[PDB]
């Protein structure tokens, strides 16, 4: 039941039980009916927290594994490698769960006219392919890097066709799309340019800020700016 599963997600959020939240929203999604704005954000929050935990754990154990390599301790490096790999498989599973929800239900069921939804979901596809790309190697890395770029690119073209430059969703897509260029592609100029253009297009059109989203728009403009100052310096 949809009310039941959604109630559960709201309570699980308050309680910071994010696996419980993600499982409830996966189920809501599997009903094959559209998600409202509220619902969409519930799904996004649940999974951002589930994968973020894994990403944080992955980075910490990767730092240990690098130090154990240089220390030259082969017996412990065996054990740190294995644990980092246990975490990776966890991380990859969350990302592919999300990416299957997107591919099988959410993007699939979008009208040629539900542009806000499509952008939101293709951004999401870019994000989780990007999280896969943070830990991937070789040919598997190539594939998920291309997958990430292709979803970000489609999302961003629709958003320029159908959304005002101050729209929070278009702005946060620009933000994550620039981050992808900077840290996944090691392409700092391409990252800076896309970030700068977004900030610039928003400012040209402050007249398009709405009552219900001006605060989020301005927050994200400042995050774009923050990144450009770090990156240019």
């Amino acid at each position: 039941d949809r009310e039941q599963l959604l109630q559960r997600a709201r309570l699980a959020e308050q309680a910071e039980r994010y696996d419980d939240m993600a499982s409830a929203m996966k189920a809501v999604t599997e009903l094959n009916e559209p998600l409202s704005n509220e619902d969409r954000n519930l799904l996004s929050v649940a999974y951002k927290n589930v994968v973020g935990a894994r990403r944080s754990s992955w980075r910490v154990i990767s730092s240990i594994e690098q130090k154990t390599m240089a220390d030259g301790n082969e017996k412990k490096l065996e054990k740190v490698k294995a644990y980092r790999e246990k975490i990776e498989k966890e991380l990859e599973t969350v990302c592919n769960d999300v990416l299957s929800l997107l591919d099988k239900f959410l993007i699939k069921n979008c009208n040629d006219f539900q542009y806000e939804s499509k952008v939101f979901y293709l951004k999401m596809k870019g994000d989780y392919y990007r999280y896969l790309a943070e830990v991937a190697s070789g040919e598997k890395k190539n594939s998920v890097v291309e997958a990430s770029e292709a979803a970000y690119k489609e999302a961003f073209e629709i958003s320029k066709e159908q959304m005002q430059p101050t729209h929070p969703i278009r702005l946060g897509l620009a933000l994550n799309f620039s981050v992808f260029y900077y840290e996944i592609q090691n392409a700092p100029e391409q990252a800076c340019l896309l970030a700068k253009q977004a900030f610039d297009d928003a400012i040209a059109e402050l007249d398009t800020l709405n009552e219900d989203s001006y605060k989020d728009s301005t927050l994200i403009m400042q995050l774009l700016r923050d990144n450009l100052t770090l990156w240019t310096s």
Partner: peptide, 4 residues
């Protein structure tokens, strides 16, 4: 910093 990606979107919170």
């Amino acid at each position: 910093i990606s979107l919170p």
